[PDB]
Write a protein that binds this ligand. Structure first.
Ligand SMILES: C#CCN(Cc1ccc(F)cc1)c1cc(C)c(NC(=O)OC)c(C)c1
Ligand SMILES: C#CCN(Cc1ccc(F)cc1)c1cc(C)c(NC(=O)OC)c(C)c1
Ligand SMILES: C#CCN(Cc1ccc(F)cc1)c1cc(C)c(NC(=O)OC)c(C)c1
Ligand SMILES: C#CCN(Cc1ccc(F)cc1)c1cc(C)c(NC(=O)OC)c(C)c1
Ligand SMILES: C#CCN(Cc1ccc(F)cc1)c1cc(C)c(NC(=O)OC)c(C)c1
Lengths: 143, 332, 332, 143, 332, 332, 143, 143
């Protein structure tokens, strides 16, 4: 819809700082700092690698629009989530304890709050029995 | 009572679809069933044993049809474990998988046969024995090992074929006149194949001194080079097992996966797929238009984490330590 | 004179129970004895050689009974080496072990037979040859290797069975009319099994051009895939030997064991199992109610040391160096 | 007996410092310091891991009582001692020299005094010939 | 239109000369063609099938001649891909390569034969099957593996030959009197060779008790030691595959090659082979008689870079990490 | 002219005693010579070919005697290369070596025979073929590999022997009544040995349905477990080759050897074995009763260097890097 | 020709500084410094190793004359260039992109200017289509 | 002879400093320092290990007398010298160049003077052709 396109254009303009028609490394760094997390040069390089595809050293608007258009169904990442959980699935049966996820997820990677891992469990564990199934989570939303 | 429903469906899907441990027990039993029928089928081709063997085979085939139909229906139901094959549409899609199609085809063919037909019975037996794979794992593993050792296998095949041709020709020259075994070069080639393979039927063998001397000198090379492909393949299989064991011991991908799941949840919450997802937004605002920027940065974080996890998703034995020490030394 | 008593009991228990080096010599001799009897037993089933073979076999079986009875009694006595099998109660418990029960059963059966019975004699011979293990080490090792290479073995078995079935069927079609060897599909399957196994009796072999061409094309694959399981198992055995050798070279568990024994003695002295143990208490007091606190802390030290030793009790080749370098790098 | 239970309760109270009904990490550290050896955070973590089983971060009284009740016969550690000695049994015959034990045991791990390794030998080597047998030691007391 | 010309020539040279992937498909087809002819040739030696087989074989041989001539001409043309075989002189030099000479010789011989000759036809078939290598890769690989395991192979050969001699002699002694199979020691040696190789024709086998006992005791050792060379060679082939795979994963020679090419261009520009090359001279002058000194220093830089690249051109598995850690430790 | 004398003696000793490269060529030729005689000897046991074969064999045996005598004398002379076998006393001691004694014994026996004797001729042929080793290298290597894989070999032997016994007994029960092949249990055991070894003479084979079914089920296990020892030994040989290659690549003992030779010369010069050795004494005095103290300290330096070199004289693959990194980390 | 010999003698004299009839390590270092690049002791050792063959520790005139006489045809380095390109030939088909060479060659080893890698491509890529062939380059000049 | 015994006793007394009937670690260190080379604690430990056999921590007189009695013929070190030379025998034929020995022996281990490696060659190379044979050297003196 046109409203979504206008919102994406506004977001790109907000990311844009010097008005060169593109989002540069410094703009990514300053938005990262504003979000609260201090960025790194390698982090911004990965930023550009994910976004940039033409190899220009910056980020353009059509690429951002196309990527935002790509929702979960175009990510083909079901196998990636399955592998991640299998790595988490120590026993391999297909059951993950809620407590282990709460303790590790809040102490590994981009750690979140306790309520956010409660939301983890609620979204993944449909029955809310505290036993998360990997396949159900990977297919329920992404697929 | 949907908790027990889901648990039972999970167990059944694990047993029927890719099994890991004791589930194979069930499959073994099923295989035995099929195997038994096959054996009885063979006993039905002998006139003396036709009566008893066919009497038992009818009952055993009815039992096999019942078991396979129950298994097919239970598999169709248990496919609901995966949300991909959910609902009637998902179950039908699962039933559309080519190997499930072959399963239902075999079931219907057996039902029709049991309702001259022994030929189709044998065909169904062999086909349902092929069905035992359902994934091509055996074929894929064999192909990978053969490709890995393709050059060595080609060396063995080339030298062994040359040895067969040369030994057959020389023994033919030695034995053509005074041995009815080697009447034509085709007989010599048959003898060479049956000798170098070490089968040694004994229908043909050299009986002259020239023939026996040449056979002695060339058989030693030929038998070794004909046994070489089996040895190469067996050693390759064992070495593949070893490397797979080491790699499994070196999965070492917990942290990238944890970051992946973290950023995946962040992307799910940031996106407008649901409206109730607002606590993560409050967490982002407390940790500091703005919402769209947060969504974009979060999805890009998800993408970078995905790529980082994928790059580390190939843990190997020696390259791992080599690269780790290179990083440590350049740090120094 | 209990020092020599204990030394002799230790030596006898080492020789009879798990032997390591030259003790096996004795076992070999015993095996030879049994083996000899078995061979003579076979010579007793031939009418021509019955007289002399049975004359020698009677004496040899009496000798075997005497040797096995002496060995059983000496083993029961030497079990006193281990304090678990101490006293009459401990010795009886040792005699209650299932393999010792089988030993005494074999002894009593042989005594009864020597006091139509040749059938039971053969049974006792085979049973006392099975007795050679007494631990299942051969079976456990075979099972471990088979399980490790289960997938490759299943691949080989599947493809080889398909090759057997296909070759047998095609050669049957080629040879059914004009070869009395292949009169029924059972004959074709027998020929295929005896060919792909490379046994090649020669009772059946293709004699048509279709049959020989099909046999030539399919035998090359079939013989290789029938020899594959043996090659896989042999390579797996050799690789297991290699990894075991490396791990043995990398026991590297002296210090955790030393700490374990230290804290074990500390726990023994702190506990009130004995009253004379007071010097360690004086050492603790000089290195500073209090006694119970010291006991508790000491037993907890023993537990932590036990867990630390157990964690390090699995030294491997590549994971060891990988983890050590990871620790070094995170230290850096 | 009731006397042993009372003694264990007194020991737990002595370990208890703030009177929270449990033995915390700091109490373990201070008792370690009182004993003479300076503790470490990892050492106290192993403390809790050995004692704690419910995963609460502290130590409770019933667990201590049960553990103190467990004498050598419930430790199932005979194989552990056998393996430790086999590691010490360089030749593998089953004989260990007294001098080597005296020199190493006092210079490895929680080293003790010379008289304490003399007691080692006396307890293990029943005949007192200076040649320690591993199996006799592992089975004489623990079994 | 020379761009498409060069692309087509490159593709054709890759397919005909050293192929890597799907190019082999073509070769396979060609091989099949030749193979078919060979098979038909065999069917032409049988009187019953002479008519049809020769009728098809004439056409198939004409097709093979056409295909091989086209391939030879296309290979001669595609050799222009490499500037070494450029122009008429370069193409003639390529045609002078010994294997191309053999190719044209085979083509001319087949043309002459197709224009008693079945003997030369068989000779050409075997020769053009040998032609399949064109590089000796199979022979070189076999020689390398045999040399690597020369000592183990010699052990196996020595012990197996001793076992053959001893078993043959003892079974001859056992069977000389009462078995027409073993009439002379030559018969005993023939039986021993056909037994220990496991071929087992059945024309000779022991029939006495002495002979069968001796055969039983010695065959177990002999068959194993005769199968040993094949197992050794197969395991060596598999291990060579493993080490080659690891080394390929550890090429790790990008930077020395980059420096090599840099200094190679520098040497090319500095040298007076061309007159237009002056921009590099300006770069050298801006980064500071003089020209000859610059040329000399540049060529010496090229030489040092060449030697450095060559020294690193042998990347191995364990020596690499050992040397890297030694360098790191001496740095520390 | 003693320089060329010593060079020639060195070359001859290298060729005759332990050879490394092209020296083996000579040995091969010699072996061929002996081999030829052996073959001709076999042809002399056949009445038809006695005349020509013996006519050639006489000349070939005279040639072999001449060659072996010349080789023995040249070896005795070339032993002077080593100062241990110097002078007449040293040469006689070399001639006293047991294998040289066997060599001269074989030479004298052949001379006597050539001066019914065909039996001693065959004995000399086999003995001089055994002579090919002269060191036991083949036997030592086989023993080392067998000992390394002793447990796996015992597993294979045990399970295969059980399979043989069980299959033989069951097929005997199946075939005793209606198959003259299995008349006694000895016949069944002979069939089982000839089947599981895969030799398959065909003199005995099951012909009933029970017998063929039991043979089919048990042969699959038996043939694999009978081929297992050969596969285990071959894989062990290949793995030993691999580890030896790596260790050779990791000799890495230059510096300890250099220190060893340095201190060895120092000990030689310090000691009073010679009087002219005084320059090293002057070097010691310039680098500062005293002479005896210098001698003592120097010999102790030699001893410490000897022990250090010996300790490092066992360079291995993984323990080397493990210990080196442990030293580096404890340095850190 | 005599002119080339005279020019080589003049070059050797220019390299010669102390007039000892040879080029020493210090002369190599000072000429390296004059060229602009700072030399290293190992670099001068490799210098001598490439030039020196008699093992005297310095560089003589006849060796320099002979080496300068050796043109590309005597280098037998065709296989070395082939291997270097194959290392550069990631796909192995025999095609190398111009952009990758421009970006790497100027950021690896003795890096040069952009125009110098343009000359790389021009000399190697005869057709000037931007797709460099390894065999054509290795054989066109060196062979 | 008695004269040699008296000389050995005098040498032991000279090594003896505190007159305890034994040569201690400090005496070994001070004699090492007097010789010119600075000793190390590990070096003196190896000293004692070579000399001491009873495990007393010092060196006694009878052991020194016995060791001095042991001449080359009792060293059984022929194989050690053979292995050392084989390590030096890069080609393995059995010939070692004089120049390589001169350059390495004076730059490896307990380096000596040029004349001392000339003596190396003279003693080993009997013919004095500059080509040292390993077996001749190992057997000429030690054997
Ligand atoms: C050595 C030899 C013979 N050859 C090669 C060959 C055969 C026919 C030709 F016409 C030409 C070359 C051969 C041998 C074996 C054991 C097999 N089976 C196998 O590898 O199973 C994995 C095959 C597939 C080919
Ligand atoms: C390949 C092939 C045939 N098969 C597989 C097979 C057999 C019967 C079926 F009915 C179905 C599949 C096979 C082959 C061998 C050598 C053995 N023996 C063995 O592995 O010893 C370790 C076995 C146990 C099975
Ligand atoms: C073991 C045994 C017999 N021998 C040794 C031998 C033979 C003849 C002699 F006169 C003397 C010694 C033997 C055995 C095999 C399988 C082969 N073939 C082979 O290795 O293929 C790679 C050869 C080349 C020799
Ligand atoms: C049957 C069989 C194998 N053999 C004997 C054997 C070996 C090789 C041959 F070639 C012939 C016969 C065997 C079996 C076992 C279990 C053991 N272990 C044992 O008894 O120690 C307790 C031993 C020591 C030998
Ligand atoms: C499996 C099986 C049979 N056995 C074991 C066996 C034999 C006789 C017994 F009386 C008892 C046990 C067996 C098999 C082979 C191939 C060999 N040969 C060999 O290993 O060469 C290296 C031997 C030495 C024994």
């Amino acid at each position: 819809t046109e409203e979504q396109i206008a919102e994406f254009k506004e977001a790109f303009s907000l990311f844009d700082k010097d008005g060169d028609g593109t989002i540069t490394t410094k703009e990514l760094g300053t938005v990262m700092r504003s979000l609260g997390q201090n960025p790194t040069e390698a982090e911004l390089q990965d930023m550009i690698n994910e976004v940039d595809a033409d190899g220009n050293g910056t980020i353009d608007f059509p690429e951002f629009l196309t990527m935002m258009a790509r929702k979960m169904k175009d990510t083909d990442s079901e196998e990636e989530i399955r592998e991640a959980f299998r790595v988490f699935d120590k026993d391999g049966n297909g059951y993950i304890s809620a407590a282990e996820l709460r303790h590790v997820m809040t102490n590994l990677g981009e750690k979140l709050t306790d309520e956010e891992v409660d939301e983890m469990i609620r979204e993944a564990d449909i029955d809310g029995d505290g036993q998360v199934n990997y396949e159900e989570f990977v297919q329920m939303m992404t697929a | 009572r949907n908790a027990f429903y889901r648990k039972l469906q999970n167990f059944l899907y694990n047993v029927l679809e890719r099994p890991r441990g004791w589930a194979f027990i069930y499959h073994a039993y099923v295989f035995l069933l099929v195997f038994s029928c096959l054996v009885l089928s063979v006993f039905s081709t002998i006139k003396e044993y036709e009566k008893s063997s066919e009497g038992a085979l009818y009952i055993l085939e009815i039992v096999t049809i019942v078991v396979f139909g129950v298994e097919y229906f239970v598999r169709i139901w248990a496919a609901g474990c995966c949300c991909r094959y959910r609902g009637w549409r998902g179950r039908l899609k699962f039933a559309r998988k080519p190997f499930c199609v072959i399963d239902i085809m075999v079931l219907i063919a057996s039902i029709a046969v049991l309702a001259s037909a022994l030929r189709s019975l044998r065909f169904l037996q062999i086909l349902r024995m092929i069905r035992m794979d359902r994934r091509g794992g055996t074929w894929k593993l064999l192909g990978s090992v053969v490709y890995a050792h393709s050059k060595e296998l080609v060396t063995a095949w080339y030298i062994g074929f040359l040895c067969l041709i040369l030994a057959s020709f020389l023994v033919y020259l030695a034995e053509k006149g005074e041995n009815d075994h080697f009447d034509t070069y085709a007989d010599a080639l048959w003898w060479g194949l049956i000798t170098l393979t070490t089968i040694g039927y004994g229908d043909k063998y050299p009986q002259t001194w020239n023939g026996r001397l040449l056979a002695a000198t060339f058989t030693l090379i030929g038998v070794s080079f004909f046994a070489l492909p089996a040895g190469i393949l067996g050693s390759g299989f064992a070495l593949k097992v070893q490397e797979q064991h080491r790699q499994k011991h070196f999965e070492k991908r917990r942290n990238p996966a944890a970051g992946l799941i973290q950023s995946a949840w962040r992307f799910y919450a940031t996106n407008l797929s649901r409206t109730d997802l607002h606590s993560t937004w409050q967490y982002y605002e407390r940790t500091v238009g703005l919402k769209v920027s947060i969504r974009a940065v979060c999805v890009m974080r998800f993408l970078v984490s995905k790529r980082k996890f994928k790059e580390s998703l190939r843990p190997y034995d020696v390259m791992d330590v080599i690269e780790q020490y290179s990083a440590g030394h350049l740090d120094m």
